[PDB]
Amino acid sequence: SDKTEPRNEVYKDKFKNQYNSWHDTAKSEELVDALEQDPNMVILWAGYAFAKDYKAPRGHMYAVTDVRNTLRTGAPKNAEDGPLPMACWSCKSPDVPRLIEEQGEDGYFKGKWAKGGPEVTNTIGCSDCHEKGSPKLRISRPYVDRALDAIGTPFSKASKQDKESMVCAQCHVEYYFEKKEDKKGFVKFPWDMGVTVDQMEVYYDGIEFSDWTHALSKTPMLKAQHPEYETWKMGIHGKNNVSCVDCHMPKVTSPEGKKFTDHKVGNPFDRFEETCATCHSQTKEFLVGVTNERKAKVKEMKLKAEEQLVKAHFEAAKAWELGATEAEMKPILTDIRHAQWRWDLAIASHGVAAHAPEEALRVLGTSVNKAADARVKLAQLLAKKGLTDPVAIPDISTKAKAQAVLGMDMEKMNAEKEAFKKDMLPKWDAEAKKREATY
Amino acid sequence: SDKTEPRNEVYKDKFKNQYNSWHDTAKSEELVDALEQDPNMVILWAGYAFAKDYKAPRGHMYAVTDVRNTLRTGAPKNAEDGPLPMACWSCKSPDVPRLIEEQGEDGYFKGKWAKGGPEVTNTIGCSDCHEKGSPKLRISRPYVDRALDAIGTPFSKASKQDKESMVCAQCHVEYYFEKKEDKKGFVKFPWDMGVTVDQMEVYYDGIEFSDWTHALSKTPMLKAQHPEYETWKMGIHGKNNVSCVDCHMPKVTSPEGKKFTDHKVGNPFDRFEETCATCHSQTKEFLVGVTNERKAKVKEMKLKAEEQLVKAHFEAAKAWELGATEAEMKPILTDIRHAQWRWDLAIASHGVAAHAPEEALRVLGTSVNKAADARVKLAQLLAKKGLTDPVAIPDISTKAKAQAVLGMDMEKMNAEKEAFKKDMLPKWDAEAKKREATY
Ligand code: HEC
Ligand code: HEC
Ligand code: HEC
Ligand code: HEC
Ligand code: HEC
Ligand code: HEC
Ligand code: HEC
Ligand code: HEC
Ligand code: HEC
Ligand code: HEC
Ligand SMILES: [Ca+2]
Ligand SMILES: [Ca+2]
């Protein structure tokens, strides 16, 4: 393109060190089946693509295999097969700013996932955060800019230290999918109101948005996704503009002598003597062991906010199954909507504990003061509908008992996924070999 | 007798720095009626001491003025009288070690409150932290050094920072008088498990202790009384050995030029240098935004905890009035005791917004999660009992409107105290100067 290059090896030389640390984002390769880890989420996302494959994020060289080989996109056969629209790339490849340059936005967006599938082939790449070649940094998706001009802080008109955290937040944020036909599958950041879990919840609620309808309690359920920049602005780090780069891209020196920026983006503790060493008088073993303590006072309340949530869908699933009305089930599924939305947001980023854990726990607190306002109103209605006992909760100890409790054909899913893994995928990588070897 | 000195005023001249600062705790008379400002404590401390009178904690020259006055203490007619016992003078004056060091603890706590009326007069001061004349921090109390010996850190160990925060730890702690016949009336701190909210729970339980049986929900209630050390131990500076002295007793520089520790104990922002300045490099008002944002996240979740509890107490007098057996209301009532305990600890130290906020929020979170399990249990139960429309809560909007909901004659509580504040108090102040003549 005029503006965007996606072939990531053109810069292996002429940016020698900065390239090979960007390859060290293949130094973190581990499927973390967080559906087998916390099988109480199979049951809370009861009726979404998440009941099928949630994983902790791994390296940055895997953004393209993973967005393919996750059970959340199935075995498509045609260029509209597959449930999820195109825009499920967006945050995986410089083959996204490339194709927003070449067809406006709309030409990228409208269309199912696999249609543009043989066109995204590079992993997360250089011209994503940077200009073409140039050492400068750009925003290479136009919604991200449109989204800043809603919170207050335009890219070019905001300090270098501001920008340090930005280009991290073209991707790592929370997003819906614009339901109008003129925006048929755009990405868009729900900031507009603000970014407290309270301000977002009030936004979506104006536009009665639903990512799905809870296939257990029939609640208009919201799905929080990677709220990184959005929680980072609440932690006393980001209260003083500790950049996203200041920790996850630590400006190191070469064996030889000159300073670059390490482009491996892993755990800032792999480069402690380099990241959080530089702004502190502490030791590691002290600071790491204190982050592993926050990483568990967030863990415990994450669970005793789910146990009231499972115990509520089923305390609502019964409420349906005695025939309650819409009129009756209104302000219950209002509460369950909110109570689970707060639970998702507070811990939909795997580092709210590191980044802003004070706000983690207040959110998780109001995700229970709501679930309460539900399970009270769900048992008072189970009374005036003739139940006075409490509802049972079947064996959801494994992922495979909780997945199978939903009548899911998790076999026909796996069957076709590693079928299409070894059937279409050879083509997408080959048909793109064709064109993208001609520049 | 030898090691104490009740008049800290006898050293006014060898230390005018250490005494004219010490004396400025009296430049602090903001008395806020924390029941005029939350009628939902009234209901939560229903049938207990602080149903009558809770106040702000003002400066130290008032503790023997405040504890002579807080309607909790009541109106003894002689000194075989009084609602409360000895161990209330424990933390309110220097006359206190002068009593254990004349006869021992047996001889102290075995008594009524107004038994030792005109024996404790001089308000808080020197020999409560010091060796008579010596500018050194001894532990004036013995129940302290026995609890400190039960957490593995007696006073001898104590790197000079540990020490520093231990002499605040004799009075700024969570305490219970003991019930058992042989250690009867003695103060005891519940650290045997111990320091944390969860660790004082296993203790206060396994041993079957109960500050009072609630008058609405007929719960065996628990009081949580101003724990600073324990919350402070969990806060970030706690984990960095940043003694209570740094923030509240900075080293203010003399008018002559000396550099003496400030003995006016109060605010770290009525001294933003010497305090926060020696560590954190931001403006006085940036670091004041935080501790207030952090203060009113707790205020939101604290109130959204009393939110449930106040309901669940009335949700329990009905289920009693609708006639329940003891055997029904059993686990429902232990949850209540577990809710309004974790809540009360989370928010008893008039500034845990500042010390560990993250821990008050997790603790405040567990409260609402534990009140939540109770109300469903109360919901199903009141349902089998002919109640299905939700339990109604009456106007409890002011102190004096909620105080008169629990039936309380504040005139025959104010009248009996406007005589005790007029008669039997300059009658103690009389024999004060008499017993203080023999010095
Ligand atoms: C040693 C363990 C401490 C004791 C005992 C107390 N604190 Fe603190 N302190 C600090 C701040 C920033 C505040 C904010 C005051 C407010 O806005 O309410 C406080 C306040 C208190 C209070 C309440 C104040 C009042 O009643 O007006 C009490 C009872 C109290 N402190 C006791 C700062 C710090 C600090 C700096 C890191 C430390 C180590 C402590 N406080 C520790 C103690
Ligand atoms: C810019 C807003 C970012 C982004 C996009 C991320 N961070 Fe952080 N983070 C820091 C530390 C010490 C951890 C602990 C890691 C662990 O315990 O495993 C994290 C956590 C993350 C993760 C999860 C790691 C993983 O493998 O998933 C991610 C994806 C992440 N962060 C992205 C340190 C900091 C930090 C200091 C508190 C700041 C500021 C940032 N990171 C900023 C960002
Ligand atoms: C930018 C706004 C993104 C869009 C649009 C989509 N994803 Fe993403 N993805 C993004 C981030 C910041 C991360 C890592 C953080 C995390 O908490 O996971 C990911 C990761 C994934 C993964 C791997 C983990 C997993 O869930 O298995 C998958 C499979 C994935 N993303 C799929 C996916 C789909 C189906 C999308 C369309 C809804 C999609 N992503 C959009 C950033 C962004
Ligand atoms: C987004 C996740 C990035 C990817 C992928 C790559 N880089 Fe990058 N790089 C990124 C940022 C936000 C910065 C900070 C620059 C600054 O000083 O503000 C950098 C650093 C650079 C620079 C300039 C400064 C430096 O430290 O070297 C250049 C010229 C650079 N990186 C080049 C580069 C190339 C060629 C990459 C593909 C191999 C690459 N980076 C990966 C963000 C991201
Ligand atoms: C869109 C191209 C992204 C941009 C720009 C940034 N990140 Fe991201 N990241 C993205 C995805 C889709 C994933 C999923 C990983 C997977 O394969 O499932 C990730 C992952 C991370 C991780 C985890 C890395 C690890 O070793 O586990 C981190 C720490 C991370 N991302 C941080 C991060 C930072 C700090 C960024 C600004 C430089 C950044 N990312 C940009 C997508 C995208
Ligand atoms: C300079 C750019 C910093 C780096 C690198 C890290 N932190 Fe930090 N931290 C910084 C500031 C300005 C503050 C505010 C306190 C102050 O002294 O002004 C902090 C505060 C913390 C906290 C407490 C609050 C929280 O968000 O949990 C922690 C736990 C903390 N810092 C830890 C930490 C660690 C382990 C780091 C390396 C990964 C780290 N910080 C980086 C500035 C900077
Ligand atoms: C028991 C003898 C105490 C010891 C030891 C310390 N304090 Fe105290 N403090 C005590 C009482 C009974 C009160 C309230 C008095 C009243 O009239 O209501 C206080 C008050 C404070 C305050 C608030 C003072 C103000 O100006 O508002 C603070 C900030 C405080 N206490 C802190 C503190 C510290 C850090 C101590 C150890 C150095 C300490 N106190 C000792 C009782 C006792
Ligand atoms: C030392 C372990 C104490 C004992 C025993 C008692 N209290 Fe005290 N009190 C103490 C502190 C550290 C504070 C400040 C925190 C707060 O919540 O205010 C207080 C506060 C008071 C006050 C001021 C207003 C009020 O809280 O009602 C009074 C009047 C008071 N305390 C009196 C009092 C009584 C009657 C006690 C026996 C039940 C008692 N205190 C116990 C420290 C300690
Ligand atoms: C506990 C609440 C205290 C009471 C009561 C009094 N002071 Fe104190 N003293 C206190 C602290 C925290 C320290 C710090 C020791 C250090 O190393 O900094 C001290 C020390 C002193 C000193 C030493 C001089 C100095 O370094 O400031 C003196 C002369 C002293 N204390 C005298 C003193 C007097 C006369 C008091 C009654 C008017 C008094 N102290 C009360 C804490 C406490
Ligand atoms: C040196 C003795 C300190 C004084 C005086 C104060 N603080 Fe502190 N602070 C100190 C340390 C060693 C740390 C750990 C992280 C770091 O590397 O600096 C902190 C951290 C904070 C935090 C964040 C965590 C929290 O408990 O909320 C805040 C908000 C903070 N510091 C502010 C603060 C204020 C307002 C102070 C005056 C009362 C203050 N600190 C005193 C060290 C020291
Ligand atoms: Ca969304
Ligand atoms: Ca108690």
Numbering used by the authors:
A (entry chain B), B (entry chain A): 32 to 470
The authors write:
In these experiments, bacterial proteins with different functions were investigated. Microcrystals of photoactive yellow protein (PYP), a blue-light photoreceptor from Halorhodospira halophila, were used to explore the capability of microsecond X-ray pulses. A nitrite-reducing enzyme, cytochrome c nitrite reductase (ccNiR) from Shewanella oneidensis, was exploited to investigate potential secondary radiation damage, caused by 90 µs pulses, at heme centers. Finally, a first TR-SSX experiment was performed on the photosensory core module (PCM) of a bacterial phytochrome from the nonphotosynthetic myxobacterium Stigmatella aurantiaca.
